[PDB]
Amino acid sequence: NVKCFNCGKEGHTARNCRAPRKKGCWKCGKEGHQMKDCTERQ
DNA sequence: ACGCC
Ligand SMILES: [Zn+2]
Ligand SMILES: [Zn+2]
């Protein structure tokens, strides 16, 4: 199971989501980096 | 279980 990193529903990932994507990161939400690069960690 | 309007 998964939760989307866009709309945030369950049973699909951001790729599989209907909706268009968000800018910057998705995890924390900050720009410059993407959620794979993201490493803020509090 | 994951990105590129
Ligand atoms: Zn979604
Ligand atoms: Zn981030």
Task: Give the topology, please.
Blueprint: no helix or strand
The chain binds zinc ion (2 copies).
It binds one DNA strand of 5 nucleotides through loops.
Family: Belongs to the primate lentivirus group gag polyprotein family.
Subcellular location: Host cell membrane; Host endosome, Host multivesicular body; Virion membrane; Virion
Organism: Human immunodeficiency virus type 1 (HIV-1)
Short synopsis of the structure:
It is classed as viral protein/dna. By secondary structure, this protein is low in regular secondary structure. The protein has no helix or strand.
Can you give a write-up of this model?
Residues 3-18, 25-40 form the CCHC-type domain. This is Gag polyprotein. It is found in: Host cell membrane; Host endosome, Host multivesicular body; Virion membrane; Virion. This protein is mostly loops. The chain has one domain (1-42): HIV-1 Nucleocapsid Protein. It has no helix or strand. Bound molecules: zinc ion (ZN) (2 copies). One zinc ion binds at residues 25, 27-28, 30, 33, 35, 38, 40. It binds one DNA strand of 5 nucleotides through loops.
Quick one: overall form? Answer: globular
**CATH topology title:** HIV-1 Nucleocapsid Protein
Please report the first level of CATH classification, the CATH class: Few Secondary Structures
| Termini gap | 26 Å
What is the overall number of helices?
Answer: 0
Summarize the amount of helix as a percent range: under 10%
Small molecules in complex = zinc ion
Number of separate domains: 1
